[PDB]
Amino acid sequence: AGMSLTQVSGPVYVVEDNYYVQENSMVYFGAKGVTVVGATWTPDTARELHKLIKRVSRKPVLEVINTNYHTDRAGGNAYWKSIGAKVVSTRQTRDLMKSDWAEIVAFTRKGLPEYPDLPLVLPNVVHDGDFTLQEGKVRAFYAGPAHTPDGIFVYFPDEQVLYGNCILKEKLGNLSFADVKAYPQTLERLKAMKLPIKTVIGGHDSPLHGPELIDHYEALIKAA
Ligand SMILES: C[C@H](CS)C(=O)N1CCC[C@@H]1C(=O)O
Numbered sequence: 001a002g003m004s005l006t007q008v009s010g011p012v013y014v015v016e017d018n019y020y021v022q023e024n025s026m027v028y029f030g031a032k033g034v035t036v037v038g039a040t041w042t043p044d045t046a047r048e049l050h051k052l053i054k055r056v057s058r059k060p061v062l063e064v065i066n067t068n069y070h071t072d073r074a075g076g077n078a079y080w081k082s083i084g085a086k087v088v089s090t091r092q093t094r095d096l097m098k099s100d101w102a103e104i105v106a107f108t109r110k111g112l113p114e115y116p117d118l119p120l121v122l123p124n125v126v127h128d129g130d131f132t133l134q135e136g137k138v139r140a141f142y143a144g145p146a147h148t149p150d151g152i153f154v155y156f157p158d159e160q161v162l163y164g165n166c167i168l169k170e171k172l173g174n175l176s177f178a179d180v181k182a183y184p185q186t187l188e189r190l191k192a193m194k195l196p197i198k199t200v201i202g203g204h205d206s207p208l209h210g211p212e213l214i215d216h217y218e219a220l221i222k223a224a
């Protein structure tokens with residue numbers, strides 16, 4: 001399918017969005033409502049994800065998390081706002097989106113001319129630090145700059161799943177916005193947290209990996 005929504009563990013699902021360059025996002029099906037992790041590429045791709053969500057649960061989509069300011073994590077925002085979902089991010093992500101959205105849209109369209117020239121749609125729930133959703137079962141945190149200055153991780157403690165965002169993935173990928181020297185420092189700060197992790201979901205390439213994906217990418221970026 002153009003997009004798939006698949007259970008990883010209990011309420012924790014992975015989204016494979018095959019539009020444009022494949023990106024993987026996540027969904028958490030909570031008792032009172034649904035949390036989307038990563039807005040997907042466009043308002044149309046967001047609508048496609050919502051269609052899949054409405055075959056699994058009738059509960060409202062409460063919020064979407066922009067895990068960075070880039071088009072693959074924030075492009076769907078207009079759609080999510082249009083159906084009453086809050087758009088959630090860190091202060092830094094919101095700040096960078098405000099200043100740099102035009103630039104990232106232009107960059108995206110250089111490789112993907114078919115990609116729409118999307119207007120800015122900012123997060124409207126903006127956090128000064130780390131934050132949780134779903135009564136602490138969805139835990140967003142910043143461990144430093146990497147693929148972008150602002151990219152965050154999302155951890156699901158009950159299921160021991162870490163969403164890797166654009167930070168963790170199989171291939172070196174795009175380094176145009178990256179802090180290449182900070183990248184391994186951020187991955188080491190992450191590993192120093194000693195989170196129980198059974199599964200890491202890569203934000204690009206094949207989603208399902210073990211905790212070793214962290215060390216895999218760390219080795220790649222040190223050689224870049
Ligand atoms: C389409 C490009 C290829 S460098 C891409 O993968 N982008 C552009 C912004 C979001 C995403 C990324 O770098 O993770």
Ligand SMILES: [Zn+2]
Pocket residue numbers: 023070072165166203204
């Ligand atoms: Zn990405």
